[PDB]
Structures are given as structure tokens and as C-alpha cells.
Design a protein around this ligand. Structure first.
Ligand SMILES: *[C@@H]1O[C@H](CO)[C@@H](O)[C@H](O)[C@H]1NC(C)=O
Ligand SMILES: *[C@@H]1O[C@H](CO)[C@@H](O)[C@H](O)[C@H]1NC(C)=O
Ligand SMILES: *[C@@H]1O[C@H](CO)[C@@H](O)[C@H](O)[C@H]1NC(C)=O
Ligand SMILES: *[C@@H]1O[C@H](CO)[C@@H](O)[C@H](O)[C@H]1NC(C)=O
Lengths: 413, 137
């Protein structure tokens, strides 16, 4: 791949057909996962606004990533499941293993568990979907579980929290979050990094570990482990993230790249520079976070793009990054080139201290929000597919777009 | 369109004594609300919130509310930028749609000691409130 910084237009993003409307709807809460030539996908279709429209339909689907015909990858759905009640499924997360995708979701009758954590039951469901369904294949094609046994230690409740995870042999690990009663949280305020921040107070880090400073719970990212060798009803076991560069529990992702897992955590508080790195150990979870000084995301007033000082805030966007060269530590993702607005998605290839090259996906005033990037080989070439929540002013239907971007081998225009 | 920035300070004549500051932003427009750093008079401290109509009418904020501006840094302009659209970095599900009215107030009194006051303040005494009649006119 091109390893040089360049302003040449070497990236050539292609809009690919979506996996799968009616006017005045929003396709929201997206998930895309990819592993071994397959993908998993989810969304919520709402009638009305993206945040508060009536929930019409939840989709959970899987399929294949295939050359569409001109050596450009695209997604071909093979197997779709629709939950009976679109109102009660939240925070799905997907892991592939042995010709099935496993999709772990929260079941809630009290709304989004994040926003009504004290009342949430803690109920979880696991859906298994064959990537290649069979004629009259019944339980092979689609199979449901409620997860009865959940080991969560000190945490009051635990939940999947991010689009996708990994398998190691026949053990699945989903990105997840633990809800810990705030009065039980152990934090040394002397560790809050405020030495370069004249207005920051030692308390800021601890107070910002929950969605409000006096929240009942703090949120701690981590993994939910599910060992398929246990049998037909494995337990699920929470595994907390280490406290190095701790930030509020937020949507995260663990993925395999070039022989090792990598973890990404969204920056939903004051630490607004990209949080990702190689996984040193899965259990206990330790992440060798990059000292990346160039990738950030839009926030609001208190914790806008490029903020590094501890503040009490809960805000941001999930815009993940996918390692494409480990030896040289080069990664790709779609970032929003704005300080405080959800606008202007740009596909970006970067190192810790340098953006190498980039491509604007739309216009400067195009609206965009969550982005989920996965990279892989198609006929010997490195490709990335990015799901981008996106729309332009005046559009009567809001729904994500999929962009395929081949990583250039040469740096020449 | 980028709308004229709104300076959140008690000298601003655009906060009309009866009705506050009324504007008609269109979907796709952008607006900055800025608490200016101290330079003529001393720094004015404010927490500024997006609230519902009743809260605006009554000049009250609730414990559940989170500020959109925390103006407590005398040597730093503090800016909040809004785009009138469905997406944002806001995590509470707050967004903007046509033919709806939105309210921004402060019940702070301008002094450091009154920063966290929950009733009255400049919302009441100076009509430091913004009414955004989105997609109207
Ligand atoms: C999963 O279960 C099998 C069978 O008991 C066991 O050998 C293996 O160590 C487990 N894997 C884990 C815990 O990663
Ligand atoms: C980032 O810097 C810290 C030392 O300040 C170091 O512990 C850590 O390993 C660095 N991360 C990487 C990926 O080099
Ligand atoms: C965005 O924020 C940065 C960092 O605080 C600032 O330097 C820049 O002027 C801001 N405005 C933009 C990108 O328009
Ligand atoms: C805000 O208003 C006061 C008068 O009400 C004025 O003295 C002060 O200078 C203004 N602040 C700035 C920095 O514009």
C-alpha cells in the first residue's frame, strides 16, 4: 500500500448497493460486522425523526461479501430475522464463528438501557443466523436464546455495547459495558490528567464516568465472553477494560487484523483523540492504546473535537478505525471533519502522528454521524467497506450508505 | 446558511425585554452561541440550557438537564455550534425538525456565586432566552 503522506487523489470511494422504503422514515441504529467473507447487519426503521420516531421494524441479517462483477466488493444478504417487537431490542453486537453469526442484544421494556439504567431488567438475548441458510432448515437457519446465566462480578448489570467482536477458537467476545454503582467505583482523583489544564479539577475524570455527574451508575467498557464449547446454553461472562486511559463506557469494537486483535472505544467524553490499539491480553482486557495526535471527532461545547483536558461531559460520535498495516501501524476510517457538528464524512488513512491521505465522501455540508469501517482482501487487494450514517438536506428518507474503498498500492496521482 | 452568531452576554440588545431573542432558523442552517471572554465590563458566568416551553415560560431548570454552554472560563471564548438537522454529537436524542419551537435559557444570575441557580436569573430579569422557531416563517 501507499505509505507516503500525499495530497494526490489516490483514494477512489465507490458507493455500493445497500444491504436491502417509505417517505418520512429514518433507518437508524446501524450495525455492520465482517468476518471471513461474511457480514452481519442490523438497523431500526423509524417513522419520523431519527431519535424519537415510532419504531417500525428491527432487522437482523447476515450475508456474503462478494465481488459484485467488476472486482469491487459488495454485500449480498442471505438470511434476515425480524424481532416480533421493534420497541424492545437494543444495542445488538455481532460475532462470526463456524458458518454462523451470533448477535447479542439487550431486551428492554424501559427504553434504551443507557438512558434508564436503574429500571432496566438486564435481560439479554442471543440470535444465531446461518450465513448460508438451507431449504426448510428451521433451527439451523435461525435460532434464538435468552441468556440466563450472566457472570458480572461487582457490576449490577452488563450489556453488549458496540457493533462487532471476535472469536478465539470457539469462544466469542462481544464489546460490552458494565453498569457499576457509582458509590462503589474506585478512582484516585490524583490520577486525573490535569497538569496541562488550568481550568480542570481533579474530580472531573470520576464525575465524567457516568452520563451525568451524579448518575447512579458509572459505565465501564469491556467484553462479554461466550464459550460455545460449553454447549447449547453457555454462560456469558463480563470482562472489564483496564484502567489505563480510562474513559466512560461507550460503544466499542474488538476485531482481528493481520493476526492479532485490536480494540477501538468511542470517545464519548473529554478524551476526544482516537482510543484504539492492539489488544495485549483479552482476559483481563488490556489495550496498548495508540498515542495518536491527529484523529478526533465532533463533540459539543464542553468536549469538542481535539479536546484533551478533563471535563464533565457525555457527548461524541462513534467513528471507528481499522488497522490495515501492523508493521507500520497504518489504519483507515471515516471521520467527521467538523468541531461540533455531525457533518462532512472523510475516508482517512493515517498513522499515530500523521494523516497520510484522505477522500471526502460527500460535500462539506453533508450530514453524517456513526461510521463503521472493516477492511479485508478481495482478489489480492486491500479493500475497506464503510457504513456511514448520511443524508443531505431535503432528503425525505434518511438511511446509511455503504462505501467501498480500495487502498492504493502506489502514491502516484 | 451560517446564521449570525449570538453573543450570550447581558449587553446584547437582541434579547428583547418581553420576548427574548426570537429567530427563525431553517433546516440545514448553522448557528454559534458564544460566551465572550473578558477583555469594558467583568466576566459574566452562565450555565445555558435547552429546555421545554414550560421551563422557558417559568424560568426553571431541572436536575436532569445538562448545559449546552458552561461559561466559566474568563480568558477563553466558549462556543456552542448548532446545525439544524437530525444528526449531532448529542447523546440524549435531541435534534431539530421543521415546524417545531425550541427554547434556550439561563437561570444563572451572571455572578460566579449564582452559576448553578435553578430558578429565575437572567431568564427572568433580562429575558436572556432564545426562541428558535425552526423551519417557520
Ligand atoms: C471454552 O470451553 C472449553 C471446554 O471446556 C475449554 O477447554 C476452553 O478452555 C474454554 N475456552 C476459554 C475459556 O477461552
Ligand atoms: C503511548 O505512550 C505511553 C508512554 O507515554 C506508552 O506506555 C505506550 O505503550 C504508548 N503506546 C504505544 C502504542 O506505543
Ligand atoms: C476547530 O477547533 C480547533 C481546535 O480548538 C480550532 O483551532 C479551529 O479554529 C476550530 N474551527 C474550525 C475547524 O473551523
Ligand atoms: C456584557 O455586558 C456588559 C454590560 O451589560 C458589558 O459591560 C460587558 O463589557 C459585556 N461583555 C463583553 C466582553 O462584551
Amino acid at each position: 500500500i501507499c505509505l507516503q503522506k500525499t495530497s494526490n487523489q489516490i483514494l477512489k470511494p465507490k458507493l455500493i448497493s445497500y444491504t436491502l422504503g417509505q417517505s418520512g422514515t429514518c433507518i437508524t441504529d446501524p450495525l455492520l460486522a465482517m468476518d471471513e467473507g461474511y457480514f452481519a447487519y442490523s438497523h431500526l426503521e423509524r417513522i419520523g425523526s431519527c431519535s424519537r420516531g415510532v419504531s417500525k421494524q428491527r432487522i437482523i441479517g447476515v450475508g456474503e461479501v462478494l465481488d459484485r462483477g467488476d472486482e469491487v466488493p459488495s454485500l449480498f444478504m442471505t438470511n434476515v430475522w425480524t424481532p416480533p417487537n421493534p420497541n424492545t431490542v437494543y444495542h445488538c453486537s455481532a460475532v462470526y464463528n463456524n458458518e454462523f453469526y451470533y448477535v447479542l442484544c439487550a431486551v428492554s421494556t424501559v427504553g434504551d438501557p443507557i438512558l434508564n439504567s436503574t429500571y432496566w431488567s438486564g435481560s439479554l438475548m442471543m440470535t444465531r443466523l446461518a450465513v448460508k441458510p438451507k431449504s426448510n432448515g428451521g433451527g439451523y437457519n435461525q435460532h434464538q436464546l435468552a441468556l440466563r446465566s450472566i457472570e458480572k462480578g461487582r457490576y449490577d448489570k452488563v450489556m453488549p455495547y458496540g457493533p462487532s467482536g471476535i472469536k478465539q477458537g470457539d469462544t466469542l467476545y462481544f464489546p460490552a459495558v458494565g453498569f457499576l454503582v457509582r458509590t462503589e467505583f474506585k478512582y484516585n482523583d490524583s490520577n486525573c490528567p490535569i497538569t496541562k489544564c488550568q481550568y480542570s479539577k481533579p474530580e472531573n475524570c470520576r464525575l465524567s464516568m457516568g452520563i451525568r455527574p451524579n448518575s447512579h451508575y458509572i459505565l465501564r467498557s469491556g467484553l462479554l465472553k461466550y464459550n460455545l464449547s460449553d454447549g447449547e446454553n453457555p454462560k456469558v461472562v463480563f470482562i472489564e477494560i483496564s484502567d489505563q486511559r480510562l474513559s466512560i463506557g461507550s460503544p466499542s469494537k474488538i476485531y482481528d487484523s493481520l493476526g492479532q486483535p485490536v480494540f477501538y472505544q468511542a470517545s464519548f467524553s473529554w478524551d476526544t483523540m482516537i482510543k484504539f490499539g492492539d489488544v495485549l491480553t483479552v482476559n483481563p482486557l488490556v489495550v496498548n492504546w495508540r498515542n495518536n495526535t491527529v484523529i478526533s471527532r465532533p463533540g459539543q461545547s464542553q468536549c469538542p473535537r481535539f479536546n484533551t483536558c478533563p471535563e464533565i461531559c457525555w457527548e461524541g460520535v462513534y467513528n471507528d478505525a481499522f488497522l490495515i498495516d501492523r508493521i507500520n501501524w497504518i489504519s483507515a476510517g471515516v471521520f467527521l471533519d467538523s468541531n461540533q457538528t455531525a457533518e462532512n464524512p472523510v475516508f482517512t488513512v493515517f498513522k499515530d502522528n500523521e494523516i497520510l491521505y484522505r477522500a471526502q465522501l460527500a460535500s462539506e455540508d453533508t450530514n453524517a454521524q456513526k461510521t463503521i469501517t472493516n477492511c479485508f482482501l478481495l482478489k489480492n487487494k486491500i479493500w475497506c467497506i464503510s457504513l456511514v450514517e448520511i443524508y443531505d438536506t431535503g432528503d425525505n428518507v434518511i438511511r446509511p450508505k455503504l462505501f467501498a474503498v480500495k487502498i492504493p498500492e502506489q502514491c502516484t496521482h | 446558511i451560517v446564521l449570525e452568531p449570538i453573543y450570550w452576554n447581558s449587553s446584547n440588545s437582541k434579547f428583547l425585554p418581553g420576548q427574548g431573542l426570537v429567530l427563525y432558523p431553517q433546516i440545514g442552517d448553522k448557528l454559534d452561541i458564544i460566551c465572550p471572554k473578558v477583555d469594558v465590563g467583568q466576566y459574566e458566568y452562565y450555565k445555558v440550557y435547552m429546555v421545554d416551553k414550560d421551563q422557558a415560560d417559568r424560568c426553571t431548570i431541572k436536575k436532569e438537564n445538562t448545559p449546552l454552554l458552561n461559561c466559566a472560563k474568563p480568558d477563553q471564548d466558549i462556543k456552542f455550534t448548532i446545525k439544524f438537522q437530525e444528526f449531532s454529537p448529542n447523546l440524549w436524542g435531541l435534534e431539530f425538525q421543521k415546524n417545531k419551537d425550541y427554547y434556550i435559557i439561563s437561570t444563572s444570575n451572571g455572578s460566579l456565586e449564582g452559576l448553578d441557580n435553578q430558578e429565575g436569573g437572567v431568564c427572568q430579569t433580562r429575558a436572556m432566552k432564545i426562541l428558535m422557531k425552526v423551519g417557520h416563517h
